[PDB]
């Protein structure tokens, strides 16, 4: 005999970005024109207490 | 330098022009203040940043 | 690994203004040197700014520029540069940046830039102590003249003063190729120039030896009978002052080795054809080209 | 002319029907030949058939070897097809054990006839030989049949086996331990200008340098003994005119992550070889350097 | 899916026998002065280039930079030229005077020995020739130009008689003489003058420059070189600048003869030896 007792693949742990809890630190938004933006700036304005 | 990524990309009004000579000679001695003479299908309009 | 990919995406890691991208979209279909050939390279390797040593040795930079990869620029969008790698013999256009005029039917060569100063006002992407300096694309007569003049300066700088070599520097640096002036930025004596001088002097002695009788005295024979403007222009650059034996089966091998030696001499200044323009644009800014890389 | 034709997607050159299929279906016949997928249609390996005698087909049943042709001055064979392994006898770089081994395998008439033809005229080898490329198939009758590849890759038909070029270990030559990402491979033939031992040095250089001036500049500095031997034979024997102290030519390029070692087996006579798996052939003519 | 086909029209009435003559020249090479789209026949070949007082070398210098097209098809009032690209493979006719074999490297040459003819037009096509015969022709023609001034003697006529013929496989072929009426053409005069000038400057300045370099001699090679030059041999510096620039300009006026780029390499010839298959190379 040269008995083969079965062939075995490898199913991965299917990781998605939102099922992983690290995306709790992330605000994830799609943007279909992202290579057309250059610098995403925000502004602020605080009057002092 | 003027924003030449806008004038050949927007809807423009039509105008029956009144040229003094052929236009390549009129660009030769600065009847226009600024200038731009592209020749082929230039990709300056094919990008927006 | 994967093979040489057709696309190299250059990503600017800095923040950018609007006017710098306005200059960047003007520089499509231009040439760049790339040393890495990855898929998603940064902007540090892009251009020749990684090679500016504190000597800026022009023969050293000239030897280093041919070792890099010439690549074309396409698709200037927001923080993406699609670098199209070249292939053997296809047809796609270019865009020059130097003020060197072009004509039709001639070849082209890659070269480090000339008269490098802000009086020329290169508007070449000033950000973060990094200026994207581009290699000049020059035709073959200007490239041959600058290589032969650099080799003349290298060979001439032996056993002479520190004032007569300066008198030769102030005389030789002016080039007037096609009604335009170009000086030589900071030419220094170097070891690469020294070994090229060594090979040149060895080849000069080999043509001095392998020349036969008639192959040397032909101009002296011609000066007795014919008289032209070329002969009076060259004979007063030579010295001032009936074949005895002749054997054509010897002269055939003499010239067979002589062409090999003259090839070995002239290959040191006629570097490599990298572009052969078929036709140009009339404003002399772009040109349709053959044999990228 | 109109906008639809330039606005249409490009026609799939494979998924459109073949010329035989569009000839058949317009007239609706049938033939015993199965047609609908032609072989070799998606090929870029530019092949060329070659006829060889039995004496030069040893070490060639295993695919991948340099089919370098020669010419004899005698008019009945105008060319002949030497293998690179058969050139090892005239190679001065081949060690004596390896030379004594590979002389014990080419003991037919054609190999030693070519060996006598190589060292007879008043010329060197670079104006005697001419490079073609790599062999991938063999018919193996008595008069065999070889299909070289001038330009392209080295693959079996239906693309299922990337063939590999082997070179013997005594002709392999690399020059830096930090090998580049992409590297090219050139064919160096140098000459030691000794009187009796004018048998040349054969080398297959694998370097990252693609330029020609910066390749011959670092090639002058690695054969300076033979360069000084050229000048030495030039000065001690004048009125003889030698030329082409070394010659190089571009053979191709490999990927540098699969250049490995192996051993050829031919009638149980093994031989350690340097193996180049994803080889390409892009020929250049015999340039020289002094 | 049409390819790059330059439409070459004609400007003359042709008979049916004229087209039957021209349709024999399908797979042949044609030099074209500019990669255009629509062209007449006056810019088709070499008869536009042929000068009475200029010769072989000046034709060859205007032959290094020509798009070597083919003739894919001929039809009513037009020809379909086919520009080749480097990488593909094409059929080339054996229109050269010398046959080929399997594996040779082929290049271009002007037709030394002598088709459509009109009143002012004669259609002429360049020779396609293997590389060793090309180098043999170059080294024959330069030496035969070097025997121009001393032509009056009785031995050198037999010497140029020996040099006038070449030998390939069953090709006992001979060339025309570059010198006409005992005075050289200005083309070959420049070609020989460049060689004599580079030899006469190499035999003059190399000794001074190698003895200048000998103090910085850091190899065992330059000393044998200067010893060789010393064994052979038994002012203001602007003259030196002028002499070195003269050396390099007479080298620059010579590169049409020092080499030849390989254009075609055959892969298999047709039986009866009238055409072959060649991969184009730059």
mmCIF file of C-alpha atoms in Angstrom, chain C:
data_model
loop_
_atom_site.group_PDB
_atom_site.id
_atom_site.type_symbol
_atom_site.label_atom_id
_atom_site.label_comp_id
_atom_site.label_asym_id
_atom_site.label_seq_id
_atom_site.Cartn_x
_atom_site.Cartn_y
_atom_site.Cartn_z
ATOM 1 C CA UNK C 1 9.903 37.796 -7.788
ATOM 2 C CA UNK C 2 7.657 39.380 -10.373
ATOM 3 C CA UNK C 3 9.331 40.678 -13.513
ATOM 4 C CA UNK C 4 9.902 44.257 -14.657
ATOM 5 C CA UNK C 5 6.452 45.774 -14.222
ATOM 6 C CA UNK C 6 5.227 48.228 -16.838
ATOM 7 C CA UNK C 7 3.953 50.699 -14.237
ATOM 8 C CA UNK C 8 5.823 52.423 -11.412
ATOM 9 C CA UNK C 9 3.516 54.457 -9.184
ATOM 10 C CA UNK C 10 5.465 57.331 -7.644
ATOM 11 C CA UNK C 11 3.722 58.655 -4.530
ATOM 12 C CA UNK C 12 4.604 62.016 -3.003
ATOM 13 C CA UNK C 13 4.732 61.442 0.750
ATOM 14 C CA UNK C 14 4.721 65.170 1.542
ATOM 15 C CA UNK C 15 1.792 67.489 1.611
ATOM 16 C CA UNK C 16 1.435 69.480 -1.588
ATOM 17 C CA UNK C 17 0.322 72.922 -2.668
ATOM 18 C CA UNK C 18 -1.789 73.616 -5.748
ATOM 19 C CA UNK C 19 0.858 75.441 -7.796
ATOM 20 C CA UNK C 20 3.355 72.588 -7.391
ATOM 21 C CA UNK C 21 0.796 70.197 -8.855
ATOM 22 C CA UNK C 22 0.250 72.849 -11.527
ATOM 23 C CA UNK C 23 3.919 72.550 -12.426
ATOM 24 C CA UNK C 24 3.726 68.761 -12.070
ATOM 25 C CA UNK C 25 0.923 68.386 -14.613
ATOM 26 C CA UNK C 26 2.989 70.348 -17.138
ATOM 27 C CA UNK C 27 5.792 67.765 -16.902
ATOM 28 C CA UNK C 28 3.909 64.810 -18.407
ATOM 29 C CA UNK C 29 5.779 62.712 -21.033
ATOM 30 C CA UNK C 30 9.148 63.706 -19.563
ATOM 31 C CA UNK C 31 12.114 61.515 -18.667
ATOM 32 C CA UNK C 32 13.139 60.493 -15.144
ATOM 33 C CA UNK C 33 15.905 58.348 -13.696
ATOM 34 C CA UNK C 34 14.784 55.491 -11.429
ATOM 35 C CA UNK C 35 17.200 53.164 -9.579
ATOM 36 C CA UNK C 36 14.781 50.808 -7.809
ATOM 37 C CA UNK C 37 12.072 49.490 -10.211
ATOM 38 C CA UNK C 38 9.500 48.625 -7.562
ATOM 39 C CA UNK C 39 5.743 49.136 -7.967
ATOM 40 C CA UNK C 40 4.928 51.766 -5.314
ATOM 41 C CA UNK C 41 8.149 53.740 -4.859
ATOM 42 C CA UNK C 42 8.435 56.973 -2.895
ATOM 43 C CA UNK C 43 9.652 60.300 -4.290
ATOM 44 C CA UNK C 44 13.182 60.176 -2.831
ATOM 45 C CA UNK C 45 14.558 57.945 -5.594
ATOM 46 C CA UNK C 46 12.672 59.925 -8.253
ATOM 47 C CA UNK C 47 15.077 62.255 -10.018
ATOM 48 C CA UNK C 48 18.743 63.045 -9.652
ATOM 49 C CA UNK C 49 18.510 64.810 -6.265
ATOM 50 C CA UNK C 50 19.904 61.706 -4.546
ATOM 51 C CA UNK C 51 23.153 62.096 -6.505
ATOM 52 C CA UNK C 52 24.250 65.656 -5.713
ATOM 53 C CA UNK C 53 27.540 65.118 -3.899
ATOM 54 C CA UNK C 54 29.469 68.008 -2.359
ATOM 55 C CA UNK C 55 31.801 67.971 -5.378
ATOM 56 C CA UNK C 56 29.046 67.589 -8.044
ATOM 57 C CA UNK C 57 31.534 65.794 -10.272
ATOM 58 C CA UNK C 58 30.198 66.140 -13.800
ATOM 59 C CA UNK C 59 32.055 63.146 -15.198
ATOM 60 C CA UNK C 60 30.961 61.228 -12.085
ATOM 61 C CA UNK C 61 27.325 62.260 -12.517
ATOM 62 C CA UNK C 62 27.650 61.516 -16.240
ATOM 63 C CA UNK C 63 28.858 58.004 -15.468
ATOM 64 C CA UNK C 64 26.147 57.506 -12.858
ATOM 65 C CA UNK C 65 23.234 58.714 -14.993
ATOM 66 C CA UNK C 66 23.598 55.967 -17.613
ATOM 67 C CA UNK C 67 23.458 53.333 -14.871
ATOM 68 C CA UNK C 68 19.978 54.470 -13.797
ATOM 69 C CA UNK C 69 16.693 53.711 -15.565
ATOM 70 C CA UNK C 70 15.163 56.158 -18.023
ATOM 71 C CA UNK C 71 11.386 56.172 -17.521
ATOM 72 C CA UNK C 72 8.498 58.223 -18.916
ATOM 73 C CA UNK C 73 5.938 60.146 -16.867
ATOM 74 C CA UNK C 74 2.187 59.810 -17.367
ATOM 75 C CA UNK C 75 -1.131 60.409 -15.567
ATOM 76 C CA UNK C 76 -0.315 63.340 -13.322
ATOM 77 C CA UNK C 77 -3.181 63.209 -10.836
ATOM 78 C CA UNK C 78 -3.358 63.839 -7.101
ATOM 79 C CA UNK C 79 -0.257 62.310 -5.481
ATOM 80 C CA UNK C 80 0.082 59.631 -8.156
ATOM 81 C CA UNK C 81 2.660 59.499 -10.943
ATOM 82 C CA UNK C 82 2.234 56.646 -13.425
ATOM 83 C CA UNK C 83 5.778 55.946 -14.601
ATOM 84 C CA UNK C 84 5.662 54.057 -17.886
ATOM 85 C CA UNK C 85 8.815 51.965 -18.212
ATOM 86 C CA UNK C 86 10.297 51.815 -21.734
ATOM 87 C CA UNK C 87 10.400 48.903 -24.158
ATOM 88 C CA UNK C 88 12.663 48.133 -27.098
ATOM 89 C CA UNK C 89 11.603 50.058 -30.170
ATOM 90 C CA UNK C 90 8.030 51.224 -29.626
ATOM 91 C CA UNK C 91 6.763 54.687 -30.567
ATOM 92 C CA UNK C 92 5.552 57.186 -27.979
ATOM 93 C CA UNK C 93 6.291 60.871 -27.598
ATOM 94 C CA UNK C 94 8.475 62.888 -25.212
ATOM 95 C CA UNK C 95 8.673 66.432 -23.840
ATOM 96 C CA UNK C 96 11.923 68.321 -23.447
ATOM 97 C CA UNK C 97 12.678 70.635 -20.539
ATOM 98 C CA UNK C 98 16.082 72.113 -21.353
ATOM 99 C CA UNK C 99 16.436 75.039 -23.778
ATOM 100 C CA UNK C 100 18.107 72.871 -26.429
ATOM 101 C CA UNK C 101 16.532 73.145 -29.861
ATOM 102 C CA UNK C 102 15.673 69.966 -31.755
ATOM 103 C CA UNK C 103 15.425 69.064 -35.430
ATOM 104 C CA UNK C 104 14.255 65.981 -37.325
ATOM 105 C CA UNK C 105 16.120 62.790 -38.159
ATOM 106 C CA UNK C 106 18.668 63.170 -35.354
ATOM 107 C CA UNK C 107 19.301 60.996 -32.313
ATOM 108 C CA UNK C 108 19.061 61.928 -28.634
ATOM 109 C CA UNK C 109 21.025 61.233 -25.462
ATOM 110 C CA UNK C 110 20.508 61.570 -21.720
ATOM 111 C CA UNK C 111 22.836 63.957 -19.905
ATOM 112 C CA UNK C 112 23.241 65.838 -16.615
ATOM 113 C CA UNK C 113 22.114 69.481 -16.868
ATOM 114 C CA UNK C 114 24.083 72.549 -17.919
ATOM 115 C CA UNK C 115 24.737 76.101 -16.618
ATOM 116 C CA UNK C 116 23.137 75.077 -13.328
ATOM 117 C CA UNK C 117 22.047 78.281 -11.625
ATOM 118 C CA UNK C 118 18.963 80.240 -10.545
ATOM 119 C CA UNK C 119 19.602 82.719 -13.369
ATOM 120 C CA UNK C 120 18.199 79.978 -15.597
ATOM 121 C CA UNK C 121 15.286 79.792 -13.076
ATOM 122 C CA UNK C 122 14.442 76.125 -13.037
ATOM 123 C CA UNK C 123 10.921 75.963 -11.570
ATOM 124 C CA UNK C 124 11.644 72.404 -10.513
ATOM 125 C CA UNK C 125 9.508 71.468 -7.523
ATOM 126 C CA UNK C 126 10.948 73.167 -4.464
ATOM 127 C CA UNK C 127 9.813 71.368 -1.295
ATOM 128 C CA UNK C 128 11.509 69.946 1.799
ATOM 129 C CA UNK C 129 15.175 70.618 0.797
ATOM 130 C CA UNK C 130 14.517 68.494 -2.298
ATOM 131 C CA UNK C 131 14.410 69.815 -5.867
ATOM 132 C CA UNK C 132 13.446 67.397 -8.638
ATOM 133 C CA UNK C 133 16.260 67.991 -11.116
ATOM 134 C CA UNK C 134 15.618 66.448 -14.496
ATOM 135 C CA UNK C 135 18.173 64.945 -16.882
ATOM 136 C CA UNK C 136 18.592 66.921 -20.082
ATOM 137 C CA UNK C 137 17.794 65.244 -23.387
ATOM 138 C CA UNK C 138 20.267 66.596 -25.936
ATOM 139 C CA UNK C 139 20.939 65.654 -29.578
ATOM 140 C CA UNK C 140 24.072 63.802 -30.647
ATOM 141 C CA UNK C 141 26.240 66.760 -31.882
ATOM 142 C CA UNK C 142 25.930 68.637 -28.574
ATOM 143 C CA UNK C 143 26.539 65.447 -26.575
ATOM 144 C CA UNK C 144 29.574 64.521 -28.675
ATOM 145 C CA UNK C 145 30.958 68.057 -28.342
ATOM 146 C CA UNK C 146 30.537 68.154 -24.561
ATOM 147 C CA UNK C 147 32.085 64.687 -24.138
ATOM 148 C CA UNK C 148 35.051 65.503 -26.374
ATOM 149 C CA UNK C 149 35.561 68.835 -24.603
ATOM 150 C CA UNK C 150 35.454 67.164 -21.186
ATOM 151 C CA UNK C 151 37.978 64.583 -22.375
ATOM 152 C CA UNK C 152 40.159 67.395 -23.757
ATOM 153 C CA UNK C 153 40.029 69.106 -20.349
ATOM 154 C CA UNK C 154 40.860 65.828 -18.620
ATOM 155 C CA UNK C 155 43.799 64.991 -20.880
ATOM 156 C CA UNK C 156 45.031 68.593 -20.876
ATOM 157 C CA UNK C 157 45.206 68.900 -17.069
ATOM 158 C CA UNK C 158 48.390 66.787 -16.813
ATOM 159 C CA UNK C 159 51.705 68.369 -15.731
ATOM 160 C CA UNK C 160 50.506 71.948 -16.116
ATOM 161 C CA UNK C 161 50.053 74.920 -13.827
ATOM 162 C CA UNK C 162 47.190 76.255 -11.731
ATOM 163 C CA UNK C 163 46.855 79.267 -14.038
ATOM 164 C CA UNK C 164 47.091 77.845 -17.559
ATOM 165 C CA UNK C 165 44.456 75.222 -16.741
ATOM 166 C CA UNK C 166 42.268 78.089 -15.513
ATOM 167 C CA UNK C 167 42.992 79.881 -18.795
ATOM 168 C CA UNK C 168 41.761 76.747 -20.570
ATOM 169 C CA UNK C 169 38.675 76.497 -18.321
ATOM 170 C CA UNK C 170 37.649 80.087 -19.093
ATOM 171 C CA UNK C 171 38.130 79.434 -22.830
ATOM 172 C CA UNK C 172 36.671 75.964 -23.328
ATOM 173 C CA UNK C 173 33.421 76.066 -21.312
ATOM 174 C CA UNK C 174 31.515 78.151 -23.875
ATOM 175 C CA UNK C 175 29.459 76.073 -26.317
ATOM 176 C CA UNK C 176 27.536 77.694 -29.182
ATOM 177 C CA UNK C 177 25.571 74.709 -30.505
ATOM 178 C CA UNK C 178 22.721 76.022 -32.706
ATOM 179 C CA UNK C 179 22.856 79.723 -31.755
ATOM 180 C CA UNK C 180 22.529 79.064 -28.005
ATOM 181 C CA UNK C 181 25.038 79.319 -25.169
ATOM 182 C CA UNK C 182 25.704 76.552 -22.639
ATOM 183 C CA UNK C 183 28.483 76.493 -20.071
ATOM 184 C CA UNK C 184 29.930 73.462 -18.289
ATOM 185 C CA UNK C 185 28.825 73.275 -14.619
ATOM 186 C CA UNK C 186 31.849 72.684 -12.264
ATOM 187 C CA UNK C 187 34.151 70.296 -14.194
ATOM 188 C CA UNK C 188 36.547 68.571 -11.785
ATOM 189 C CA UNK C 189 39.406 66.140 -12.353
ATOM 190 C CA UNK C 190 38.261 62.712 -11.189
ATOM 191 C CA UNK C 191 39.366 59.083 -11.049
ATOM 192 C CA UNK C 192 36.653 58.042 -13.516
ATOM 193 C CA UNK C 193 37.936 60.724 -15.877
ATOM 194 C CA UNK C 194 41.462 59.486 -15.095
ATOM 195 C CA UNK C 195 40.783 55.879 -16.109
ATOM 196 C CA UNK C 196 38.983 57.069 -19.252
ATOM 197 C CA UNK C 197 42.071 59.179 -20.013
ATOM 198 C CA UNK C 198 44.172 56.054 -19.429
ATOM 199 C CA UNK C 199 42.163 53.989 -21.920
ATOM 200 C CA UNK C 200 42.237 56.914 -24.368
ATOM 201 C CA UNK C 201 46.035 57.266 -24.225
ATOM 202 C CA UNK C 202 46.495 53.504 -24.644
ATOM 203 C CA UNK C 203 44.217 53.520 -27.692
ATOM 204 C CA UNK C 204 46.086 56.556 -29.064
ATOM 205 C CA UNK C 205 49.364 54.674 -28.800
ATOM 206 C CA UNK C 206 47.790 51.634 -30.434
ATOM 207 C CA UNK C 207 46.697 53.680 -33.458
ATOM 208 C CA UNK C 208 50.157 55.312 -33.379
ATOM 209 C CA UNK C 209 51.692 51.844 -33.700
ATOM 210 C CA UNK C 210 49.209 50.072 -35.956
ATOM 211 C CA UNK C 211 49.291 52.775 -38.630
ATOM 212 C CA UNK C 212 51.255 51.637 -41.664
ATOM 213 C CA UNK C 213 53.595 53.626 -43.914
ATOM 214 C CA UNK C 214 51.109 55.031 -46.438
ATOM 215 C CA UNK C 215 48.409 55.403 -43.760
ATOM 216 C CA UNK C 216 50.590 58.039 -42.112
ATOM 217 C CA UNK C 217 52.259 59.663 -45.119
ATOM 218 C CA UNK C 218 49.071 60.048 -47.197
ATOM 219 C CA UNK C 219 48.482 63.629 -46.030
ATOM 220 C CA UNK C 220 52.147 64.457 -46.718
ATOM 221 C CA UNK C 221 51.750 63.035 -50.218
ATOM 222 C CA UNK C 222 48.500 64.933 -50.793
ATOM 223 C CA UNK C 223 50.052 68.227 -49.665
ATOM 224 C CA UNK C 224 52.462 68.054 -52.626
ATOM 225 C CA UNK C 225 49.792 67.877 -55.346
ATOM 226 C CA UNK C 226 46.333 69.018 -54.229
ATOM 227 C CA UNK C 227 45.611 72.256 -52.369
ATOM 228 C CA UNK C 228 42.311 73.085 -50.664
ATOM 229 C CA UNK C 229 41.058 75.109 -47.714
ATOM 230 C CA UNK C 230 40.742 71.972 -45.570
ATOM 231 C CA UNK C 231 44.365 70.996 -46.194
ATOM 232 C CA UNK C 232 45.672 74.444 -45.270
ATOM 233 C CA UNK C 233 43.424 74.432 -42.199
ATOM 234 C CA UNK C 234 44.753 71.054 -41.020
ATOM 235 C CA UNK C 235 48.354 71.018 -42.323
ATOM 236 C CA UNK C 236 49.248 74.017 -40.133
ATOM 237 C CA UNK C 237 48.060 71.899 -37.217
ATOM 238 C CA UNK C 238 50.432 69.085 -38.206
ATOM 239 C CA UNK C 239 54.205 69.451 -38.090
ATOM 240 C CA UNK C 240 56.118 71.342 -40.755
ATOM 241 C CA UNK C 241 58.421 68.965 -42.634
ATOM 242 C CA UNK C 242 56.848 56.312 -54.957
ATOM 243 C CA UNK C 243 56.111 53.742 -52.223
ATOM 244 C CA UNK C 244 59.166 51.837 -51.085
ATOM 245 C CA UNK C 245 57.261 48.662 -50.236
ATOM 246 C CA UNK C 246 53.586 47.750 -50.474
ATOM 247 C CA UNK C 247 51.780 44.545 -49.493
ATOM 248 C CA UNK C 248 47.955 44.736 -49.564
ATOM 249 C CA UNK C 249 47.522 41.419 -47.730
ATOM 250 C CA UNK C 250 49.318 43.103 -44.806
ATOM 251 C CA UNK C 251 47.428 46.414 -45.029
ATOM 252 C CA UNK C 252 44.084 44.582 -44.932
ATOM 253 C CA UNK C 253 44.884 43.199 -41.464
ATOM 254 C CA UNK C 254 46.470 46.525 -40.485
ATOM 255 C CA UNK C 255 43.230 48.388 -41.143
ATOM 256 C CA UNK C 256 41.205 45.494 -39.698
ATOM 257 C CA UNK C 257 42.910 46.070 -36.362
ATOM 258 C CA UNK C 258 42.943 49.836 -36.910
ATOM 259 C CA UNK C 259 39.152 50.077 -37.127
ATOM 260 C CA UNK C 260 38.940 48.062 -33.895
ATOM 261 C CA UNK C 261 41.290 50.517 -32.179
ATOM 262 C CA UNK C 262 39.422 53.547 -33.507
ATOM 263 C CA UNK C 263 36.178 51.978 -32.277
ATOM 264 C CA UNK C 264 37.819 51.527 -28.870
ATOM 265 C CA UNK C 265 38.780 55.199 -28.914
ATOM 266 C CA UNK C 266 35.491 56.667 -30.136
ATOM 267 C CA UNK C 267 33.258 54.543 -27.896
ATOM 268 C CA UNK C 268 34.471 56.576 -24.894
ATOM 269 C CA UNK C 269 32.677 59.743 -26.073
ATOM 270 C CA UNK C 270 29.770 58.500 -28.267
ATOM 271 C CA UNK C 271 27.842 57.013 -25.362
ATOM 272 C CA UNK C 272 24.536 55.348 -26.432
ATOM 273 C CA UNK C 273 21.604 56.315 -28.635
ATOM 274 C CA UNK C 274 18.524 56.374 -26.401
ATOM 275 C CA UNK C 275 15.976 58.212 -28.581
ATOM 276 C CA UNK C 276 15.608 58.832 -32.317
ATOM 277 C CA UNK C 277 12.903 61.392 -33.071
ATOM 278 C CA UNK C 278 10.977 60.819 -36.289
ATOM 279 C CA UNK C 279 9.066 64.124 -36.284
ATOM 280 C CA UNK C 280 8.729 67.081 -33.933
ATOM 281 C CA UNK C 281 6.249 69.759 -32.935
ATOM 282 C CA UNK C 282 6.796 73.188 -34.547
ATOM 283 C CA UNK C 283 7.007 74.982 -31.184
ATOM 284 C CA UNK C 284 9.917 72.609 -30.358
ATOM 285 C CA UNK C 285 8.611 71.468 -26.980
ATOM 286 C CA UNK C 286 7.543 67.893 -27.730
ATOM 287 C CA UNK C 287 8.450 65.277 -30.306
ATOM 288 C CA UNK C 288 7.279 61.866 -31.467
ATOM 289 C CA UNK C 289 10.072 59.414 -30.730
ATOM 290 C CA UNK C 290 11.310 55.896 -31.463
ATOM 291 C CA UNK C 291 13.140 53.328 -29.279
ATOM 292 C CA UNK C 292 12.421 54.341 -25.713
ATOM 293 C CA UNK C 293 15.282 53.020 -23.606
#
